[PDB]
From a paper:
[name], a hyperthermophilic carboxydotrophic archaeon, produces H2 through CO oxidation catalyzed by proteins encoded in a carbon monoxide dehydrogenase (CODH) gene cluster. [name] with a DNA-binding helix-turn-helix (HTH) motif is a putative repressor regulating the transcriptional expression of the codh gene cluster. Monomeric [name] adopts a novel ‘eighth note’ symbol-like fold (referred to as ‘eighth note’ fold regulator, [name]), and the dimerization mode of [name] is unique in that it has no resemblance to structures in the Protein Data Bank. According to footprinting and gel shift assays, dimeric [name] binds to a 36-bp pseudo-palindromic inverted repeat in the promoter region of the codh gene cluster, which is supported by an in silico [name]/DNA complex model and mutational studies revealing the implication of N-terminal loops as well as HTH motifs in DNA recognition.
We determined the 2.8 Å resolution crystal structure of the wild-type [name]. There are two monomers in the asymmetric unit of the wild-type [name] crystals, which is compatible with our demonstration that [name] is a dimeric protein in solution. The structures of the two monomers are virtually identical; their structures are superposed with the root mean square (r.m.s.) deviation of 0.490 Å for all Cα atoms. Monomeric structure of [name] resembles an ‘eighth note (♩)’ symbol in that it can be divided into three parts: a flag, a straight stem and a note-head (hereafter referred to as ‘eighth note’ fold regulator, [name]). The flag part contains two N-terminal α1 and α2 helices (residues 1–34), the stem part is a long α3 helix (residues 35–62) and the note-head corresponds to the C-terminal α+β domain (residues 63–146) in which a three-stranded antiparallel β-sheet (↑β1-↓β2-↑β3) is sandwiched by the stem helix (α3) on one face and two C-terminal helices (α4 and α5) on the other face. The dimerization of [name] is mediated mainly by the flag and stem helices with a contact area of ∼2300 Å2, covering one-third of the molecular surface of a monomer. The long stem helices from two monomers form antiparallel X-shaped cross interactions. In the dimeric structure, two α2-turn-α3 HTH motifs are ∼35.8 Å apart from each other (using the Cα of Glu42 as a reference point). In the wild-type dimer, the side chain hydroxyl group of Thr55 in a monomer is hydrogen-bonded to the backbone –NH group of Phe6 in another monomer, which directs the N-6 region to extend out of the main body. Two benzyl side chains of Phe6 in the N-6 regions of two monomers form π–π stacking interaction to stabilize the observed conformation of the N-6 region.
Author numbering:
A (entry chain B): 4 to 139
B (entry chain A): 4 to 142
The structure:
């Protein structure tokens, strides 16, 4: 059991096969507007689900450090490394790997944060980003 | 933002710091039963979210093959391998790697499946298992 209805999974699957919203509406015998709304609602539930798994894996993080809007991306690896020594736990990434990770996934605008976010280490030692700032 | 309330996030965090459900009930000033019911509902929503992402990546899967209750786990690599050549795409896993995956994750009872499930290849080329059989959705 999931957060998607059977109807939403069917529409998403038919979309994945390349069918237009108007084509799918005819197969299911409902308005094209209803199909568009149903697809939009499903994608929103998937994003909501994706953020939920992010908050769960963040709650169980080895080490997490917070980056504020406007900070420099290159100052971040030290923040993580300093807190990692405070907890005496190893961060299995070079300063460059952390940066190349932040370029691909962080809300940045050329080395500057455009929003607050937290960078953390997965329980599986993956690097991850979340936009929920948890107080501690 | 997500499917978790601010209350459920606080409780999960306190559990992750090792507290007992009764300790948490005191901190939030409510019954221990309420804390357990809120914690159970939160983990259930996380599993529900985890299954929603699986179905999403299954809908966009490279290659998928379906296995029914009673089939032999050892016949599965051939089904996947034949279906990958019909689509002319590579599966970066040996027959043994596929087997050792199904032993760890599939609903099997000694090399025989106790329920239907779908084995598929992630968009990131990971191996994955899902229990929703969506190949009927093809006409």
């Amino acid at each position: 059991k999931s957060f998607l209805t059977e109807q939403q999974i069917k529409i998403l699957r038919l979309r994945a096969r390349g069918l237009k919203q108007s084509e799918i509406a005819e197969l299911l015998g409902t308005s094209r507007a209803n199909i568009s709304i149903l697809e939009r609602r499903a994608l929103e539930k998937i994003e909501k689900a994706r953020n939920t798994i992010t908050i769960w894996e963040q709650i169980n993080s080895k080490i997490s450090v917070e980056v504020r809007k406007g900070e420099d991306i290159f100052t971040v690896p030290d923040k993580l490394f300093k807190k990692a020594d405070e907890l005496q736990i190893k961060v299995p990434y070079s300063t460059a790997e952390i940066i190349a990770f932040l370029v691909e996934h962080a809300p940045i605008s050329d080395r500057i944060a455009k929003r607050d976010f937290t960078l953390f280490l997965d329980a599986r030692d993956r690097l991850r980003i979340s936009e929920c700032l948890l107080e501690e």
